[PDB]
Design a protein around this ligand. Structure first.
Ligand SMILES: *[C@@H]1O[C@H](CO)[C@@H](O[C@@H]2O[C@H](CO)[C@@H](O[C@@H]3O[C@H](CO[C@H]4O[C@H](CO)[C@@H](O)[C@H](O)[C@@H]4O)[C@@H](O)[C@H](O[C@H]4O[C@H](CO)[C@@H](O)[C@H](O)[C@@H]4O)[C@@H]3O)[C@H](O)[C@H]2NC(C)=O)[C@H](O)[C@H]1NC(C)=O
Ligand SMILES: *[C@@H]1O[C@H](CO)[C@@H](O[C@@H]2O[C@H](CO)[C@@H](O[C@@H]3O[C@H](CO[C@H]4O[C@H](CO)[C@@H](O)[C@H](O)[C@@H]4O)[C@@H](O)[C@H](O[C@H]4O[C@H](CO)[C@@H](O)[C@H](O)[C@@H]4O)[C@@H]3O)[C@H](O)[C@H]2NC(C)=O)[C@H](O)[C@H]1NC(C)=O
Ligand SMILES: *[C@@H]1O[C@H](CO[C@@H]2O[C@@H](C)[C@@H](O)[C@@H](O)[C@@H]2O)[C@@H](O[C@@H]2O[C@H](CO)[C@@H](O)[C@H](O)[C@H]2NC(C)=O)[C@H](O)[C@H]1NC(C)=O
Ligand SMILES: *[C@@H]1O[C@H](CO)[C@@H](O[C@@H]2O[C@H](CO)[C@@H](O)[C@H](O)[C@H]2NC(C)=O)[C@H](O)[C@H]1NC(C)=O
Ligand code: NAG
Ligand code: NAG
Ligand code: 7JZ
Ligand code: 7JZ
Lengths: 387, 387
């Protein structure tokens, strides 16, 4: 989408994965979907380094809507958002952050909240711009394929017409099977800043693997369509939550990074461990994700040993390599060479291990190297020519 | 098996899951299958509280064998076990531990090492007794159903004839589908102290879940056959390794405990975190697993919320309850009562949370309670009547 926004993948925090549709503030005031939740996350993002590392978006997801007023305008739940959305945007903006919001192209949101139908698209867009929203995620429940075909372009146009730059996240392809000919990716690139290709991420390693598998199986189609202003979205980071081990958390970060994916957290930033914070705030990892070229990486190698190699091209002749173990036994000594991974010859390379910080020097194409990869884990290299 | 052994489930450490068939001691001296690995693990069990908590078995698995000597007598690999097995048994015994060993009823072990064929059963049993081995795991690769049908009873009798009490771990059912009509559990209880029912555990939550699911699907068959001296074996604990999150780790421990499973670790005790040690060395958890009645627990309730309730009966009218979330979203507030869980009425109960140590007192059948269960996690209660 040519709106000047998201020249690199979006970074921030989204409420949905960790906090879902929890509206019981009387019993659970600390974790319910409320202005307090978002204000507290904003505080954390300002104070705990998140903003300084580039995590700038703070995104409301489903279950925020109170209803529609007399003139049909969307309003937040008065009991859970008493100061209103403009106050929340003001608060978020004052902390150097951006506010995202959520709507659904259809009769209702997935959770049954007032939906944005075709006749409400223009009005809701205007409402969001007036509230000074910076991002919108448009879900696609309770609609027909026809209504989506009309509606998603209609919202992209409506947001445009408001004059306010608003990042546009599109669930449309997820509800169509994510593949051509039903899905038209050239059109999605033109109308959206990012799109959810596939199934909702869940707090499990299985969920991560199934998303990876789908992106890899269809990478010939998916890889070329990503770039500055228009990204594939394999969904939220799980790091900080319940279902991923340490190795798996490091794997998701590394793999989302080489896929030029959004880095959208969804976790309790108030209680996140230092170890998980270290994964998410890794400066080299972020720099790689935010590479100005915006070229989505690919799986370039698979072996019977269940070691996979992913590669992403980066600016200044650099590369990201992710050696990924699908094994479930023990650390694996993976032997390879840059030549066997199709790198340019008569150039001496050097690598920095993204997690350990170690530097491997003197790698020619023919040089045999060994990486030790933990089960359901990764080794990640930032690779560059030295001479 | 009526040899006076394993009146409670065995507790200890087994090499296989974490260290597998790594025989490359030249490149990987610290982690290869060698006498040094076993000696170092024995040292850790003696010094770090494991033995004192009841973890007494230190068990060799596959890939220890060097061949057979001129008398047809089994030999360890001379390069990896230069001192021999009697040396290791003596070392282990001097630390108050017991030594387990591994053989295969068939032409070869699963990894291709010399097998204990029918004509070698007596000789190998005698060898193990002479070495002063305390436990034998008899794997079932490279044999026919009829060879196993003769071989397992033959081994039990052969071990008996040595005059040395040797705990007998039988993989027989795992190679027969683990179910009637092919598996006779009344026969197994007579000839074996424990038996591997089902698939090898791998370092993943999916693996834990598939094992749990199979055990629960078949609990009407499996539950009644377990008792003092004859246990079901759902395989090794993964706690300390790579694939399980903290919640999943606590889950496996609690669920193995309610299933009256062996508590056989397979992890690097030299590098184990304080957190994982705290799970495995939980005194109340161990007490429950080691309950003298040896009654295997059951899943007694399942809900569309994906909360499962497991119950194990214990001595002196006590019980263990495991509230288990198969959910993959967020913490779940599970509302229930002891009456809804079919506990005896007009009795006042008290519960201790096994992980937190909190005491919930004065629970009647009618008393509503709430437990907050994390995704892929548990809450575990030790429950008993009070005056
Ligand atoms: C509604 O939709 C319209 C499009 O239909 C949007 O209009 C586009 O707005 C974007 C962002 O403001 C414009 O992109 C910018 O173009 C600047 C100039 O480019 C001119 O020259 C090139 C020749 O190469 C022409 O192709 C082009 O038509 C322009 O005439 C650039 O200077 C900007 O670059 C910025 O980013 C780069 C990063 O690579 C930095 O290095 C620069 O410093 C700079 O910051 C940028 O690329 C685009 O020109 C507009 N398109 C059209 C067709 O008009 C509206 O923004 C949108 N409205 C809303 C509110 O959503
Ligand atoms: C090789 O195989 C043989 C035969 O299977 C084994 O011999 C058995 O050993 C077990 C375990 O020691 C014996 O079981 C115990 O018997 C005690 C008393 O038994 C007497 O009476 C019976 C007949 O009723 C005779 O067989 C026996 O000779 C004795 O005279 C019990 O007191 C024990 O009770 C235990 O369990 C109860 C639970 O009910 C607990 O409350 C107690 O605390 C206690 O721990 C126990 O049942 C069994 O009797 C032996 N059978 C035979 C036929 O002799 C060998 O042990 C085995 N050897 C090796 C090296 O593996
Ligand atoms: C999305 O909703 C439309 C709009 O109708 C709504 O639901 C009706 C049951 C009623 O409560 C209206 O007031 C709502 O506005 C659905 O379109 C209707 O479809 C039915 C046949 O299924 C038809 O009889 C009605 O005439 C349609 N409504 C009008 C007046 O346009 C539509 O079914 C919903 N989309 C899906 C497929 O989920
Ligand atoms: C176990 O080993 C025996 C003895 O070697 C095997 O019997 C041989 O099988 C091979 C290959 O099938 C034949 O070529 C020979 O004719 C057999 N030799 C003898 C001495 O019988 C037997 O197949 C093996 N059993 C299993 C179940 O793997
Ligand atoms: C690297 O190892 C491969 C395979 O083991 C071998 O063919 C080759 O000779 C080695 N190359 C170098 C430069 O040592
Ligand atoms: C538990 O709570 C429910 C609320 O619906 C109530 O019906 C029930 O009587 C309560 N149990 C008691 C006896 O406290
Ligand atoms: C749409 O459905 C839910 C909200 O109910 C959530 O936003 C999810 O990420 C979705 F799939 F986009
Ligand atoms: C048999 O196979 C392997 C050894 O090769 C291991 O012992 C496993 O636990 C088994 F299933 F028992």
């Amino acid at each position: 989408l040519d709106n000047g926004l998201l020249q690199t993948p979006p970074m921030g925090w989204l409420a949905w994965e960790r906090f879902r549709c929890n509206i019981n503030c009387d019993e659970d005031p600390k974790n319910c979907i409320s202005e307090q939740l978002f204000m507290e996350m904003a505080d954390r993002m300002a104070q705990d380094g998140w903003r300084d590392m580039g995590y700038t978006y703070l995104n409301i997801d489903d279950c925020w809507i109170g209803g529609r007023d007399a003139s049909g305008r969307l309003m937040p739940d008065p009991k859970r958002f008493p100061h209103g959305i403009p106050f929340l945007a003001d608060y978020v903006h004052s902390l150097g952050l951006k506010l995202g919001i959520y709507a659904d192209m259809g009769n209702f949101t997935c959770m049954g909240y007032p939906g944005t139908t075709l006749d409400k698209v223009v009005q809701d867009a205007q409402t969001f711009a007036e509230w000074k929203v910076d991002m919108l995620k448009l879900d696609g429940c309770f609609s027909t394929p026809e209504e989506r075909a009309q509606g998603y372009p209609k919202m992209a146009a409506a947001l445009n017409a408001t004059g306010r730059p608003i990042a546009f996240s599109c669930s449309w392809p997820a509800y169509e099977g994510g593949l051509p000919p039903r899905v038209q990716y050239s059109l999605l690139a033109d109308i959206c800043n990012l799109w959810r290709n596939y199934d909702d991420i869940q707090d499990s390693w299985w969920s991560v693997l199934s998303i990876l598998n789908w992106f890899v199986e269809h990478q010939d189609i998916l890889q070329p369509v990503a770039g500055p202003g228009h990204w594939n979205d394999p969904d939220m980071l799980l790091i900080g939550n319940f279902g991923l081990s340490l190795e798996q958390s490091r794997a998701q970060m590394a793999l989302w990074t080489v896929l030029a994916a959004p880095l959208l957290m969804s976790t309790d930033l108030r209680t996140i461990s230092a170890q998980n914070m270290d994964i998410l705030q890794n400066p080299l990892m972020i720099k790689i994700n935010q590479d100005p070229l915006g070229i989505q990486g690919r799986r370039i190698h698979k072996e019977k040993s269940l070691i996979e190699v992913y590669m992403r091209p980066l600016s200044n002749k650099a590369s990201a390599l992710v050696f990924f173990s699908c094994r479930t036994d023990m650390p694996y000594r993976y032997h390879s060479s840059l030549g066997q991974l199709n790198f340019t010859g008569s150039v001496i390379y050097e690598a920095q291990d993204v997690y350990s910080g170690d530097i491997i020097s003197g790698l020619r194409d023919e040089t045999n190297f060994t990486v030790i990869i933990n089960p359901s884990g990764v080794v990640m290299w930032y690779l560059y020519p030295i001479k």
